[PDB]
Every structure is written in C-alpha cells, then in structure tokens.
Amino acid sequence: ATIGRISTGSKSLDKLLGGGIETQAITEVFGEFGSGKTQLAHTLAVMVQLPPEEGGLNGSVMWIDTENTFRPERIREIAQNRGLDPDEVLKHIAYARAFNSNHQMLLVQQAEDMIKELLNTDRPVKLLIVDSLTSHFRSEYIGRGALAERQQKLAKHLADLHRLANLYDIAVFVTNQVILAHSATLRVYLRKGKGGKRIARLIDGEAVFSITEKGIED
Numbered sequence: 001a002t003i004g005r006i007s008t009g010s011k012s013l014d015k016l017l018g019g020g021i022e023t024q025a026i027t028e029v030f031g032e033f034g035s036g037k038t039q040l041a042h043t044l045a046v047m048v049q050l051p052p053e054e055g056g057l058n059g060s061v062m063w064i065d066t067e068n069t070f071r072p073e074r075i076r077e078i079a080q081n082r083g084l085d086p087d088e089v090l091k092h093i094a095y096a097r098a099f100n101s102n103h104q105m106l107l108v109q110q111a112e113d114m115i116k117e118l119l120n121t122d123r124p125v126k127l128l129i130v131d132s133l134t135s136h137f138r139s140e141y142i143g144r145g146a147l148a149e150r151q152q153k154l155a156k157h158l159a160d161l162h163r164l165a166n167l168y169d170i171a172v173f174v175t176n177q178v179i180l181a182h183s184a185t186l187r188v189y190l191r192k193g194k195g196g197k198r199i200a201r202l203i204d205g206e207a208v209f210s211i212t213e214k215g216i217e218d
Helices: 011-016 037-047 072-081 086-091 101-118 135-140 146-168
Strands: 025-031 060-065 093-097 125-131 171-177 186-192 198-203 206-212 215-217
Touching: 011 198, 011 206, 025 037, 025 146, 037 060, 037 072, 037 125, 037 171, 037 215, 060 101, 072 086, 086 093, 093 101, 101 125, 101 135, 101 146, 125 146, 135 146, 146 171
Parallel strands: 025 171, 025 186, 060 093, 060 125, 125 171
Antiparallel strands: 186 198, 198 206, 206 215
16 A cells, blocks of 8 residues: 555645655654643644645544543644634544553554444544653553663554554554653654744654644644
C-alpha cells in the first residue's frame, strides 16, 4: 500500500514533516509539559477525517489515553471551526483509557479487532493515537534494573504499533513527556516559543505554529 499523509493543520509543520504525518509509520512528539503534544493529537484526530484533497484520509481514529487528557469538546470545537460536523467527527473516534502499562499493551492488541472491522468501510481507521506512550512505563518501571526492563517492554509495545501501522496502513501518533533508545519512525521535538508559539524540530529547520480555535495552525 502507498503511504498516506495527514495534515497537522499547520502548513509550517506539514512542510517540516514532508507533507504531513505518514501512515505506515510511528511519529513520536516529545517535549515538556505544556509543549502542545495533546493539542496536536486532538487536531490530527479531526484532520484525518477530512477528504484527501483537504489533507485528510477520510479516516476514523482510535485513541488510547493514559492521562485522562482527551477532551471531547475540544474535538467538537476544532471540527466545527474547520467546517465539519462536531458530533460526526467525535463519533468516529474510538476512545479507551489505559489503566496501566499492561492494559495499554492489551488495548493495542485489542485495537486490531476494530481496525479489521472498519478496513473496508468508507471510513477505515487511519490514525491511532497513544497519549501518553510512556507515562505508565515511567511510573511502573523505576529503579535499579528498570532501564533494561522498561525499554524491552516498550520495544514490544512499539513493535505491536509498527505492525498495525504497516499491516493496515495507519498513522500511529504517540506523545512522550521529556540517552535512551527510541524506535519510533520519526521523532519531533516540540517546545514553547515566543508569542505563544510552539516550535517543532525533527530529531535524528524548524516549524512554528499556534494553538487556536482550529486546533493548530500557522
């Protein structure tokens, strides 16, 4: 399958990414608390539902939330301000709270059932969000010996996510609050800038965007 691209809502960030976030890939955004990772996730969950000529993939969304940070009314606001029906956009997001890292891992395996269900509908899953990828792993695997154990479990979790992305032509988008190794396909460092702006840099130019009533935009 040919890769698809999802606009982030920001022309600047889209250019940095080579056209938007890619299916058949895991894109990790990382940065400090308040850098805008979850706002970008909310915006992508709307943008993917647009038709392709508007930067979407006519796609549905699966969202795994580890911090109780998903806000349905933020989805509805972004959708309405981009000309989409807020309730239809919200309905196309399958939402699950992960209680711990082991539940988070099961939820990714569980997501395959709905992905298969929707694969040949007119709105297949095209975006899978894990927000936060790492928070439960950081809280649970701590102290001497935890580095190797945590990295091995995360590697398995990321392998599961890579398989879904690659097998079903899905963009996986994950957040990480920040020498450790990482296996996302692309890592984007996000930080606050002047004038309320957020600045994005690819890790291993910079894009600048604002958080607005449309989610994010230049």
